[PDB]
Design an enzyme around this catalytic site. Structure first.
Site: not given
Ligand SMILES: *NC[C@@H](*)CC(=O)OC
Lengths: 75, 172
Positions: B63, B79, B117
């Site tokens: 993430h 976040d 994200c």
């Molecule tokens: N790496 C993609 C980020 C989005 C994410 O954290 O999905 C839960």
């Protein structure tokens, strides 16, 4: 001999290596120190990606040469 | 491919996209195997740091979040999954910061990440850096609420396809 490995997170780390060490050896040395499997590492010297089978001397990596490490990781 | 896989920015791609948007060489952070790597010097110089979290020897895909330097001793965590998710890494990252500093979780809402994200970090991430560092800063509630609004306005009217179109383009 001593070389440097720099990451995209700004960690520089020293390694002790022979010029006859393969690139795969170097990755195993990174796995041991950093816990990163060779699986996850792309290595680069003078904008060239380094092949697992070739040696450090195949690329003219002197004493005190700096390699770059990029990890095959995403979010 | 180096920069984007499906829609997920890689470590290499997050560097790339910042360089293209004109931010020079940006240093990122990670939490890999529960262990952070945060270059406090670079966070200082840059004012912010995208950090890839929840990766390790068995997880290629984690993430992205954003560390933000405010004025004085104050720092912020954005976040894209929201406030609650952001609280998860608050302690471990606050322990990496210079002595005497604080870390606060920007209070934006959940349910808006949508798999994106990394994109959010590179847009809204930066707009929050700006907001908390400007002449008359809005409060930290205002900031969180504003971000939540921006995320949902940007998804409106087929926003998802447009953003993923752009991540695809960036891969070339
Ligand atoms: N790496 C993609 C980020 C989005 C994410 O954290 O999905 C839960």
């Amino acid at each position: 001999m001593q070389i440097f490995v720099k990451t995209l997170t700004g960690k520089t780390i020293t390694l002790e290596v022979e010029p006859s060490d393969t690139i795969e050896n170097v990755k195993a040395k990174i796995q041991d120190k950093e816990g990163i499997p060779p699986d996850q590492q792309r290595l680069i010297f003078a904008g060239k990606q380094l092949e697992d089978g070739r040696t450090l001397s195949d690329y003219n990596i002197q004493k005190e040469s700096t390699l770059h490490l990029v990890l095959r990781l995403r979010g | 491919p180096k920069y984007v896989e499906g829609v997920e920015l890689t470590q290499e791609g997050m560097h790339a996209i910042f360089a293209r948007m004109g931010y020079g060489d940006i240093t990122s952070g990670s939490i890999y195997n529960g262990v952070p790597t945060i270059d406090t010097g670079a966070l200082n110089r840059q004012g912010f740091m995208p950090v890839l979290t929840g990766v390790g020897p068995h997880r290629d895909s984690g993430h992205w979040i954003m560390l933000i330097k405010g004025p004085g001793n104050q720092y912020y965590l954005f976040d894209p999954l929201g406030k609650t998710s952001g609280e998860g890494y608050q302690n471990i990252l606050a322990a990496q910061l210079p002595m005497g500093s604080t870390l606060s979780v920007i209070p934006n809402g959940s349910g808006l990440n949508m798999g994106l994200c990394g994109y959010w970090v590179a847009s809204a991430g930066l707009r929050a850096h700006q907001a908390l560092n400007q002449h008359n800063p809005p409060t930290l509630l205002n900031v969180g609420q504003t971000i939540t609004n921006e995320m949902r306005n940007e998804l409106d009217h087929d926003g998802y396809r447009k953003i993923t179109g752009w991540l695809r383009a960036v891969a070339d």
